[PDB]
Design an enzyme around this catalytic site. Sequence first.
Site, mmCIF file in Angstrom:
data_model
loop_
_atom_site.group_PDB
_atom_site.id
_atom_site.type_symbol
_atom_site.label_atom_id
_atom_site.label_comp_id
_atom_site.label_asym_id
_atom_site.label_seq_id
_atom_site.Cartn_x
_atom_site.Cartn_y
_atom_site.Cartn_z
ATOM 1 N N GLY B 1 4.953 -1.851 9.207
ATOM 2 C CA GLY B 1 5.087 -1.977 7.768
ATOM 3 C C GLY B 1 4.387 -0.871 7.001
ATOM 4 O O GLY B 1 4.331 0.272 7.454
ATOM 5 N N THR B 2 3.852 -1.215 5.832
ATOM 6 C CA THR B 2 3.146 -0.268 4.980
ATOM 7 C C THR B 2 1.645 -0.493 5.103
ATOM 8 O O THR B 2 1.175 -1.634 5.037
ATOM 9 C CB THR B 2 3.587 -0.407 3.522
ATOM 10 N N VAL B 3 0.900 0.594 5.271
ATOM 11 C CA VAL B 3 -0.531 0.520 5.545
ATOM 12 C C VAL B 3 -1.292 0.243 4.255
ATOM 13 O O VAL B 3 -1.022 0.849 3.212
ATOM 14 C CB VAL B 3 -1.011 1.820 6.217
ATOM 15 N N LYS B 15 -2.550 -3.102 9.408
ATOM 16 C CA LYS B 15 -1.533 -2.776 10.401
ATOM 17 C C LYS B 15 -0.621 -3.976 10.618
ATOM 18 O O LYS B 15 -1.085 -5.041 11.033
ATOM 19 C CB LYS B 15 -2.185 -2.355 11.723
ATOM 20 N N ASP B 114 -3.540 10.056 24.685
ATOM 21 C CA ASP B 114 -3.158 10.888 23.541
ATOM 22 C C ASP B 114 -4.410 11.122 22.690
ATOM 23 O O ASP B 114 -4.594 10.543 21.616
ATOM 24 C CB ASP B 114 -2.036 10.249 22.723
#
EC number: 2.7.11.22
Lengths: 243, 259, 55
Positions: B1-3, B15, B114
């Site tokens: 979604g949107t943070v 999150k 990573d």
Amino acid sequence: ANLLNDRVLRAMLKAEETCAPSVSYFKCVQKEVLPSMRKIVATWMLEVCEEQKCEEEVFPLAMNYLDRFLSLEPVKKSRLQLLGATCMFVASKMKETIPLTAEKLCIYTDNSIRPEELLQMELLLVNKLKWNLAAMTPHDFIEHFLSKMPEAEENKQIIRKHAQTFVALCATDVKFISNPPSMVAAGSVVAAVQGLNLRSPNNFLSYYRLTRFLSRVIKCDPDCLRACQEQIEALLESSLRQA
Amino acid sequence: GTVYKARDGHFVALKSVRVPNGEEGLPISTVREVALLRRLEAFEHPNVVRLMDVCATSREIKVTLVFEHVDQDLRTYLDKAPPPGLPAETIKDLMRQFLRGLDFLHANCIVHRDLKPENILVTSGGTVKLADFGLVTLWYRAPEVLLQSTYATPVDMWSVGCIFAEMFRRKPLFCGNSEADQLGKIFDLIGLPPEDDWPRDVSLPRGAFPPRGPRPVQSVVPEMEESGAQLLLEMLTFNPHKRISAFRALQHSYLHKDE
Amino acid sequence: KPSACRNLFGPVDHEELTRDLEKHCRDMEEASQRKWNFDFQNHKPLEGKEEWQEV
């Protein structure tokens, strides 16, 4: 070396102190269920895990989920089996490659519960536990103990299997909710090394050195470990009596 | 979604993840990765981002993870450094926190896979906090990753060396086009490894690279000391089974705090 | 059906059960929304202890 210090083992004893149920949820939290009913449902889940050939950790991990939910919420008598079927549903996802299906667990309840009722109970159980599902299992400590014992692999498989039987019998008994997984695993190992009294143990590491080694890594007096071994072998005698 | 983001008296990030749902409740990957993230906060490590809560909301299900937030990452910290660069003792302090948090993840069977300065996050008080784990820039990937071979936890120790040299440089060590070019950009310094140190079931055979020799290490990071150069080599070793571990690097004398 | 397939403690009031699980799936979700000033299904900030931003 890390084999001399064992930073892994100390981290395991620290993690065991978080996913711990309460000693007195029967007297303080639960109204309808009694310790006789927990043994009944626990006996049922053990038979399910044995019929479905579940991984060795599934049944004790489910009992850990069950005792922890009963330490937080009062559960009705008619919904104790639903809680038990749900605890196996989550534990199977955490320890098995192809977990048990929701429909098979409902069948094992004689179709007393419905699939979506189990899925809704899954969301309730996992949220109530705040997603703390990666609890330390006695199997974790058993594999760590066997990695420090200088025994033949053929002898280790019998010890591992006998202790896993002792661990399962402890999960059905109420007297072992207060015991951490390290204590349950250590007592199961020294009880298994005695070989069910079918043979005088011939181990490369003596039982005296084994118990005192296990007592100093799990931080307990050797007499406390002996009393746990006695309670486990007493459980074995009572389990065999029911026939 | 949107943070999302909030402050009290600290800072908190958001999150949201929507998972399939339907077949048999929550997915296997969902319950296991979130539980392992829950398992790490039982230890409360100061060099790892703190997960605060987990909220599932049910058709449809959406479980939202609430993390601890910091604004500054490593590259902002490196760009904000004094013009001559970071002091040696400051770099050794960050390298200690880096290896402490990395050894904490490796001890819990977590490979970062990573690691880059955009992932290492530094607080306003100088505390390093790793993030983005358990859930293109090829410059920090280990050679066993660029060859698509069997990779384990030593892939993070190669990334540590690249960033170790980057703090003294403020310029990345190896910058390449593809995986074939990056591996060529790796053999500038450590030379071309022999035959049996090369694995098979790889993507690129050994004959794909010209015979090269190892160059001196202080040609790429001269502002470092000689003892720090041998520590960089142990991190930047081709064979992942000879590569130095995170715990062994903390016992190195170069990162030993004096007095 | 196998031997382990058995009902343990009588029948289940299914209508009251899904009624009970909807009240408590809402209870924990409302307490979580009241803890963070953030309704998670609505995915919108609320008002209180935290000042909610967006990067």
